[PDB]
């Protein structure tokens, strides 16, 4: 399983971006989420969605501006973040937990800047 994080880069206030997250590579099923980290912080909690894509959660600091979504045919999960803050620049991870082995995988991680 490798999951490959693309989208991101620098961003003006305000704007919006779309991440996005291709897993590759049997098949189980996963818990997708996002993850940021900013520099000399703690990893934190952006969002995730269920394996049937029925529930989602998402940190107090997004909620209501980002949408976190499944694309099945392009095994793809997004995050889509509007009215971006310089408190949102961080590295953004995807990570994939998987339910069945109950083993995690991680992303590259993407960076977003946002000036």
């Known amino acids: 399983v490798k999951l490959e994080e693309s989208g991101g880069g620098l961003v003006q206030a305000g704007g919006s971006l779309r991440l996005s997250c291709a897993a590759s590579?049997?098949?189980?099923?996963?818990?997708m989420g996002w993850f940021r980290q900013a520099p000399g912080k703690e990893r934190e909690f952006v969002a995730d969605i269920s394996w049937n894509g029925g529930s989602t959660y998402y940190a107090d600091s997004v909620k209501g501006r980002f949408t976190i979504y499944r694309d099945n045919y392009k095994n793809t999960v997004y995050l889509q973040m509007n009215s971006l803050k310089p408190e949102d620049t961080a590295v953004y991870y995807c990570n994939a937990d998987d339910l069945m082995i109950d083993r995690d995988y991680w992303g590259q991680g993407t960076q977003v800047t946002v000036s």
């Open positions: 590579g049997t098949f189980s099923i996963y818990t």
